[PDB]
Amino acid sequence: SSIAYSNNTIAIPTNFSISITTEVMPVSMAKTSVDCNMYICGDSTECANLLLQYGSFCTQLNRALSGIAVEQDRNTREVFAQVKQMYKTPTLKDFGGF
Amino acid sequence: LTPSSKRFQPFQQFGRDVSDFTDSVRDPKTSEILDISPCSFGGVSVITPGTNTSSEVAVLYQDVNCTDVPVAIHADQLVYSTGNNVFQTQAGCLIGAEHVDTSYECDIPIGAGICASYHTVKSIVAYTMSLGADSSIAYSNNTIAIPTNFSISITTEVMPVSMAKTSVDCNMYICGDSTECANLLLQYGSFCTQLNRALSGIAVEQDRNTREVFAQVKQMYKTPTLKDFGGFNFSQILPDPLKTKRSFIEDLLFNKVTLL
Amino acid sequence: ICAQKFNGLTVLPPLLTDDMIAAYTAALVSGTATAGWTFGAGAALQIPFAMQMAYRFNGIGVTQNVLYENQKQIANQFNKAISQIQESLTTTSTALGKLQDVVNQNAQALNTLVKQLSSNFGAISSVLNDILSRLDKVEAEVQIDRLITGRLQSLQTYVTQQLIRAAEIRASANLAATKMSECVLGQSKRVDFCG
Amino acid sequence: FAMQMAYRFNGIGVTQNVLYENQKQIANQFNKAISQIQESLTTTSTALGKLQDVVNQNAQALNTLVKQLSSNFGAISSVLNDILSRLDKVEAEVQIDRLITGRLQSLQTYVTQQLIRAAEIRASANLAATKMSECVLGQSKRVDFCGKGYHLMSFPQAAPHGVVFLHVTYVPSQERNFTTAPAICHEGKAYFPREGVFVFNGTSWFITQRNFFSPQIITTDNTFVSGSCDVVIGIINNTVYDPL
DSSP states (O other), rough: OOOOOSSSSOOHHHHHOOOOOOOOOOOOOOOOOHHHHHHTSSOOHHHHHHHHOOOOOHHHHHHHHHHHHHHHHHHHHHHHOOEEEEEOOOOOOOOOOO | OEOOOOOTTTTOOOOTTOOOOOEEOOOOEEEEEEOOSSSSSSSOEEESOOTOOSSEEEEEEEEEEEEOOOSSSSSSOOOOSOOOOOOEETTTTSSSSSESSBBBOSSEEEEEEEEEOOOOOOEEEEEEEEEOOEEOOOOTEEOOOOOOOOEEEEEEEEOOOOOOOOOOHHHHHTTTTTTHHHHHHHHHHHHHHHHHHHHHHHHHHHHHHHHHHHHHOOOOOOOOSSSSEETTEOTSSSSOOOOOOSSSSHHHHHHSSOOO | OOHHTTOOOOOOOOOSOOHHHHHHHHHHHHHHHHGGGGSSSSSSOOOHHHHHHHHHHHTTOOOOOHHSSHHHHHHHHHHHHHHHHHHHHHSSOSHHHHHHHHHHHHHHHHHHHHHGGOOOOTSSOOHHHHHHSOOOOHHHHHHHHHHHHHHEEEEHHHHHHHHHHHHHHHHHHHHHHIIIIIISSOOSSSTTTOO | OOOHHHHHHHTOOOOOOHHHHSSSHHHHHHHHHHHHHHHHHHHOOSSHHHHHHHHHHHHHHHHHHGGGGGGGGTOOOSOOHHHHHHHHHHHHHHHHHHHHHHHEEEEEEHHHHHHHHHHHHHHHHHHHHHHIIIIISSSSOSSSTSSEEEEEEEEEEEEETEEEEEEEEEEEEEEEEEEOOOOOTTTTEEESSSEEEEESSSSSSEEOOOSSSOOOOOOSSEEEEEEEESTTOEEOOOOOOOOO
């Protein structure tokens, strides 16, 4: 672009336009949940007994997943639930030509 | 085991899926294809108002269409399975909770816009969530509402600023005091050295967080002796000289939070 | 999805259904159209839309006579821009590329987790049934341990990736909440924040 | 302080005469709100639910880490003493390796979770620093950033592992309906208001602020002319008093 600098000249607009732009923002992600035995073992009693010996690994995994899910619910609620009143939709939807 | 329509090759004896799960098998004596599914079936969730309050609970089956998928070969029914007080929640069947048309705030979320709570009637009640207080707004082309009075509202905002600084030891944790275990651990490299580096970074970051949040004034302005400024009583939020260095609200806040 | 269901992998439905979010957005738009910026700062005070737009023009250093003299042009530009965005959205486009990206990311993560079962992790086989039907208990312990360690590592990797993705999505959601507070419920003086 | 609050009122579109005339009411409301928050804090409340939440999170993480030692991780036992006293060196190497790998994995999981939590806490701390800069050391024009309503000032307070901000806000109330006009036609030219809006109490047309009903006579200093009366819709005929 060519920009000319002047010590005694200014450019001022004489008209204007209305521009509507879109901005897309992710707000939440899918809430997932997993099972200790059905994934690690399935339906095997012996595998379940063996897995018990590892302690509280999958318990903490479940805790993390639950935290993620409740966080997603909170994300959506805080982004959207910002009006305390559910204003009624007007039947007349033209407001001074808009 | 259940009958299946799966197409098996002439010689095939069993078949599995992408996750190497044997979802089909051939009967060696009758040569009929049988599908086999797990027993857990996934997704049972329990809704409890707290053992301290009551021992009554409700059961949500995530994707059942209110049927007996949890094969009924157990005494009792698992609270019940396909009883009378059944509600068909979007993506779920809920049993043990009473459905009420009136909608309230959410207490125990279930999903699909359905929440449950321990209301009195005392039992577990499920309902649809309440979005907000319905309001009537009148639009006029030649009228406006202007306020004629005002009020002063003081609101609180709590913000975590730092977390506890933790440090760990390589041998004291992994091994303890065993020389042989320490020698064996040396062969694993520099794992715990990098763990210590990460923990030190976290601790220094916490110190920096607190300092940057609070250390924004280069001058420690003196606390005024007169704590009334044109009728504004600041004595509740400023330290009391007689006491110790904290203000009353600060003392309340420290007391509120409980800090093998 | 059937394999995910048979391996304990499930998706919980969101708390707010699409209808409730649509109701929230309709309420917000109605409040903006009727009460203007005021409904976000306390009580909702009605104002004719022309006067609200005159105040919004004043907010950007333009006297209100401009709007009262060019109302027809401004309304026509508003409507034409709305129709343009409508058509832009309806013509196959990547406008919603972030949302589809997060959906695809979640689907791919679940698919990778479920497909990780096929790996035998250096054991005799990746299936417990054949290990238990071929090798006796004492010898089978080693194979079972190998498979359990591998599958636990897969679960931990999935959980860590989900945690980091959730942190990123929380950052985006906080930005969206701030944008709703500052652009929708009021007029924003920050440059390039609200468009 | 009176003049400081007068400037803060001016900052939200309210003339300073409002404060100088209602100083007693504003001070009383300030004190009543402070007492209300005091009593709110003293009554068992979840006000500090985030701070206690982070404390509980750290405690639970440490407890899980320490309890992870009881797991034998598929080895002969979870204790090194009995393994070393029962099995000779070469054979015991397998058990030692099993336990060491398990405990290293537990430590790595704990450290990764701590790193993610530290990132979240850093985000919160940066937000708190921005709030201190913009709400406490100044007046914020951002909506809902420094409390619901129109921001006047803020006061910080310490708390275990966090900061509590007391945001003072001006919320209008006691609404009144009025009939208004975009402009006023006078001698064939349209007068627009320099600030505020025209209103009609039922007797005559006045000019007032948007944020407070302070009716004032329509003059030439608070109104400016532009164009004619045939180009704006809603213009209503009336006279504009001239101080001369």
